[PDB]
Amino acid sequence: MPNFFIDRPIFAWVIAIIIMLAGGLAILKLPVAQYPTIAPPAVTISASYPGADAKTVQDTVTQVIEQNMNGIDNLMYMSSNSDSTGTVQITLTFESGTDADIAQVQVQNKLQLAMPLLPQEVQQQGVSVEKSSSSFLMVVGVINTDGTMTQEDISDYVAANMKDAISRTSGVGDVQLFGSQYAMRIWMNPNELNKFQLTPVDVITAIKAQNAQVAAGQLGGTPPVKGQQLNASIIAQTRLTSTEEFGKILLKVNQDGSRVLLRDVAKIELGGENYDIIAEFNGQPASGLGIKLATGANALDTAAAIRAELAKMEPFFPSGLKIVYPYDTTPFVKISIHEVVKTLVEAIILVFLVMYLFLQNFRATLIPTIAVPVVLLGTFAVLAAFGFSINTLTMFGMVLAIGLLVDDAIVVVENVERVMAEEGLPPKEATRKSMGQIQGALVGIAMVLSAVFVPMAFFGGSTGAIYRQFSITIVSAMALSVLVALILTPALCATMLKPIAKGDHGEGKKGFFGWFNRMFEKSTHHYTDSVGGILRSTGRYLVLYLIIVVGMAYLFVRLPSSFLPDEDQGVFMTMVQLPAGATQERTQKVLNEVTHYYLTKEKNNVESVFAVNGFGFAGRGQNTGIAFVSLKDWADRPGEENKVEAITMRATRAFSQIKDAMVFAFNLPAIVELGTATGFDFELIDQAGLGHEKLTQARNQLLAEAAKHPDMLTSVRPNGLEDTPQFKIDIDQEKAQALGVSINDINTTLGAAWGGSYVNDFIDRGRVKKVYVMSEAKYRMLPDDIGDWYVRAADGQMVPFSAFSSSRWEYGSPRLERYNGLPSMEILGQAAPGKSTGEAMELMEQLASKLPTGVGYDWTGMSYQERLSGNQAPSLYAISLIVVFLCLAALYESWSIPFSVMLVVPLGVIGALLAATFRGLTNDVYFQVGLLTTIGLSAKNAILIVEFAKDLMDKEGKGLIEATLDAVRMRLRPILMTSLAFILGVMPLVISTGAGSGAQNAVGTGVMGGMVTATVLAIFFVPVFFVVVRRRF
Amino acid sequence: ADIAQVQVQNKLQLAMPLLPQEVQQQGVSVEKSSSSFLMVVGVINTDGTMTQEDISDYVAANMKDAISRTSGVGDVQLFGSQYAMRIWMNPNELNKFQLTPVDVITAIKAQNAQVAAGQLGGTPPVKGQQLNASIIAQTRLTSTEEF
Amino acid sequence: GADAKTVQDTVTQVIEQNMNGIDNLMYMSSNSDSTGTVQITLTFESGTDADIAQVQVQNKLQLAMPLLPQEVQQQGVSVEKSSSSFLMVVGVINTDGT
Amino acid sequence: ANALDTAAAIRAELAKMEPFFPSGLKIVYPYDTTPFVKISIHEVVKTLV
Amino acid sequence: GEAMELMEQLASKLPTGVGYDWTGMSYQERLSGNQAPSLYAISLIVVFLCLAALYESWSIPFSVMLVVPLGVIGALLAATFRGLTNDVYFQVGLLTTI
């Protein structure tokens, strides 16, 4: 074929024109996001029961929705929270590769039939099902500079004139809104109320009467009466539209022809919907959008486009309405890309340099420089051919292949200079025989390296998807190379490659270039019979091997593992947990201090603090917060003391001066759904009606018994909340009867006062918006305030709760957890410094097996993935090995000679893990594919060597011991050139710190040192193998 | 089938608010499965310590849910009934104390309820409120005895 | 029986604003009369598989729904694949005024 | 759905339950149309060997 | 097309923030136009490339490609004075002339 292409020159040019022209049409139109999609898809169901405690939520709403997720295809598990803030969320995780669009439809449907059972008030708020994809593209914030506009003021504006504009800018997937638009707020006064003999039920009603909108009819309605001139629409009642109009609402007429308005019995401002979360930004009233990325959009693209839309709203803003960007994935992705496209440019230049310094001439060294950029542009086609995308993970493929992409190219062009100076044949005709020696040694490179990568895109689970990301990229770039080398490069050798006379070498020249082939030729010889020395007594050397086969095997298992290195991503955040019962205000105080420690102790790094009070990340409570700290550019933050594992220390340390409030700052992983490299996820399950208390015991048993094996298990903690006190206002039924007081009247009076109640809607500035009635905050703060609230009895008399009820404190649980529909408790922890995540698991199960009967356990999340799919490599690669042998045998028509290629595996391995160990790193994915391209080069160098030796033996019938010296001899130069290139091309990563360093570091530092020993060591070894392996049968 | 079921149900929802309220409270259901039993799982006591009644209840409250929820299970029929608070009226007594079943019902509604009672320290609060706790009112009864 | 402005504001919008992040959405157009009646139409790029298209819409619909007036939810709101012109028109007459 | 696969899963879910029943309560298998489909296929893989 | 292009003119001379768009029937025609250029462009590029592979030249193609403009003009004429239009069918015609 390269023969057919050595002749046909333009055919091999056309093909090339296409390929780049294809992967160019594809480069310059293909999705860019930071990562792809690793986590199995999962739909979440959410609901508010305004005012409900955790049990109420749980027994009137959660259990019902749960009893109903049936005949929904591909569920893995189903967990759910029921919180004392009236909140309930239920998440269902599906099989990997389930259609998220179907799963969410099915759920959404099965809900739609359970709604007839949920409480009216829940139905009113509405339940709601969405897909989970908590990877925000960016987060705009919106401050007022004047200090005029409240949280609620600002959020309204955003929800009014911005949210939709952004909602629609091409590329966006989802828009959340930090606040709500306004809501009409009737704020009740039990006293005003108790004057005019009124319940809030009364307020509730009048509002419904006098804010409804009413069907009318229409003048000259069809069927008309014969002979008709007019047809028009009658307009009856519609909806109040102002706090004014609202206050005007009539409520009662007392004996004396008197008139009681609504404003007469309450305040009527125009607040927000939910007063639970307080977020401000660098201390000032805030709000704004978390924008996510539509599936298959362009991060960089939509990212700009969204700035674009903001821009053109900024004129029309009110008095001092600044816009701020505490998060934008984009800076990182750009920088991540500008740093990879560079590693690509860099490598090309270094190949130009290592050829011109070994073959010497702007021709031979212009060959791979216009051939690799063909393969790469061509991967971006077969990449886009499987709908992939340019993301951190595919970009680190192909620049992890670059080594295999050159060894492919170099070794053709070099194998031409070799015969075109040893038999001194011409240009065109010299390139045959050159590529009759390498033909199926490249077409075995193909089938062998397939076997080393492909079986990677087979690992089950989440991490499974990462491996695919590489596994395709590599094989896609790789097989496309072994093609370019069969087609364009042979054709490029024999066209820009001026002949060299049998022996031209350059052993005498007017410069350095002379000295090179001079002192290279010395060193060629200096080494070739050094191999020769080895060959007589070889058993001394198999001992160095057997103590390298163990060398890795001693390490490797000593090496710690993980998934993905963190990076200084630009933001980081601080936790804040004030204890049981602490309030919104107490919590805010603490956030302020945290905002201070950053805006002082740290200016120079912190660019802003987004602090959210009410939403902590282990709950929604008055007693929890979170602060989102965005930093100044990587540029202005030089050295380990301006990056993040640093600033974190000075805060996490710094935050033990806060006596009340558990407050730890920390850093987000690369992929947000990763979960600790060594963390397990354990569910304790109530399996026979046991009840909260009994489970809580069980839990503690296990949790106490757990924390007395620090040998193996650290930080075994409960993920949920501790029980707490709650004020129970039990009604005497009998009593209420007697006095003529209707339970429902009682109930909603209290509920309305203390919980609030969405009444109906009204229209504000052409916008439908909620209307809530709820007691002004002064009459609803402490148990003694109950006093103020009068219900009305059968006979018109005003009656207080002491008449017919009693109070009493008790324990609670403000959060109730359930796994697979049974009640549960989430236990987290890790295997103790030294052990494996699997051993911890193993132990935990054994500790659990000893609990009271009716208590069960089950693993989830990370630890569920792992329990199923994380054991495969042994099993898997067994089948790769079997195909590496079978590929090799075929190539070498030998049931045995393959053996001398395969035994080169550990040689790379060792230098690779060596460099990770004496450098403080982890056996992770970036290191792990490294290990594969390193097995990859070292097997395909050993392919060509054990090829040549096998040939001059069947071709010429040369010496078993002499063909080898000849094989080694001629194949020595390529090896060196390629590996000089590689080892220099990896240099720039291996030191890199700053914007995305850990990424860079992990791929480099493992491959570089493994290239050193794979090479500066297989020189001696591969011929040692061939000899020993041949003389076995 | 996925889609068929999806479409089927888009139409059904249209009619939903026309069914009688009591029809909806039982839940209309839209399955898609083979007409025929794939298999039947039996469950017996062997101590004679549980009744027919009992086992039908174990099974419903403790096994049904997951089988129903299990990918591939299109439908699950169960050979019995899960328990229920059973108020077996007597028309004589009712007439003695001069009450109809309406009363019993209106009673049970009022007196077997779970309500939402807001919070002490209700956001939005008053300056410097320091305590915050749930209010708890009536909650669904849970024994024959309480009924 | 609601005036268009009334309807426009409380139905149409609420739906519309939720009609985002629908793959291959090419464009949408909606209109709302005085008889009280709304017709949102979403058109897609050719290629788009209409049954998945339908699904995505019902999915976003959902999120709007609870937000719309009660009597709207009463009336049903339908989500279906469409087309602007009749294949045909069977008609029907009597020939003897019975 | 695949009958054989769905039968597998029903069994193994049922395994997760059993450790926690009241005493006495045994699961029994009064009727199943999988172990034939399974057994059947085998006697053919046999006549094929 | 003309009728459309007149309109676009009259459009751009209106109050500000009162923009316009083309939908349905129209929107598909506009899109037909915009892609014609690229349609003939890459179409040629392929033929050029298909011939170079073929007659091993670089010039045999580069000479054939010069014959294209002559077949077109006659095509153009045959409609230009037949009262016809550069509708969709023509653009197929043109790729067939090539």
Ligand SMILES: CC(C)(C)c1csc(NC(=O)c2ccn3c(=O)c(/C=C/c4nnn[nH]4)c(N4CCC[C@@H](OC(=O)NCC[N+](C)(C)CC(=O)[O-])C4)nc3c2)n1
């Ligand atoms: C994680 C990552 C990517 C590194 C990052 C970088 S920056 C950032 N996020 C922020 O900087 C930020 C800044 C302010 N926030 C907020 O102010 C709120 C809450 C705002 C609010 N809503 N009503 N009043 N104030 C919030 N959520 C707080 C929890 C609710 C989530 O979704 C909503 O915005 N929905 C509003 C409805 N409520 C609040 C009622 C929650 C519900 O789910 O029922 C997100 N998240 C945020 C998040 N995240």
